[PDB]
């Protein structure tokens, strides 16, 4: 579908060098043990990250654009839930989500 091509384009942009300075914490699943975040999976019940969204897009797991958007926003919501708002990862999340939301709002009819 046309809308899922738009989603795939957004995903390509989120993973591109253009945004790499702030997108990189979202490239792969949070490795809680490696980062010393031993409470992460007590707080975040449904982890999400861009490599998982990419795999689901490639396997045509998204029935529509709404399902894709729900995973992307889940990613950002997990970051806002786990991390205090003054932590740098939150400023990075907000910049990346600005990129996402403004382009997602251009979804072709």
């Amino acid at each position: 579908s046309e809308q899922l091509k738009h989603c795939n384009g957004i995903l390509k942009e989120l993973l591109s060098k253009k945004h790499a300075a702030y997108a990189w914490p979202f490239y792969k699943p949070v490795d809680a043990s490696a980062l010393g975040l031993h409470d992460y999976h007590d707080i975040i019940k449904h982890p999400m990250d861009l490599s998982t969204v990419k795999r689901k897009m490639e396997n045509r797991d998204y029935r529509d654009a709404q399902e894709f958007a729900a995973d992307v926003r889940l990613m950002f919501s997990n970051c806002y839930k786990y991390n205090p708002p003054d932590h740098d990862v939150v400023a990075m999340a907000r910049k990346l989500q600005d990129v996402f939301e403004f382009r997602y709002a251009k979804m072709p009819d």
């Binding site: 790499a20 300075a21 702030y22 990189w24 914490p25 980062l35 010393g36 975040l37 786990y82 991390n83 932590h87 740098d88 990862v89 990075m92």
Partner: peptide
């Protein structure tokens, strides 16, 4: 912003 953490999640 420089691609790594000085302190994970908290400090670039």
């Amino acid at each position: 912003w420089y691609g790594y953490w000085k302190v994970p999640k908290r400090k670039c």
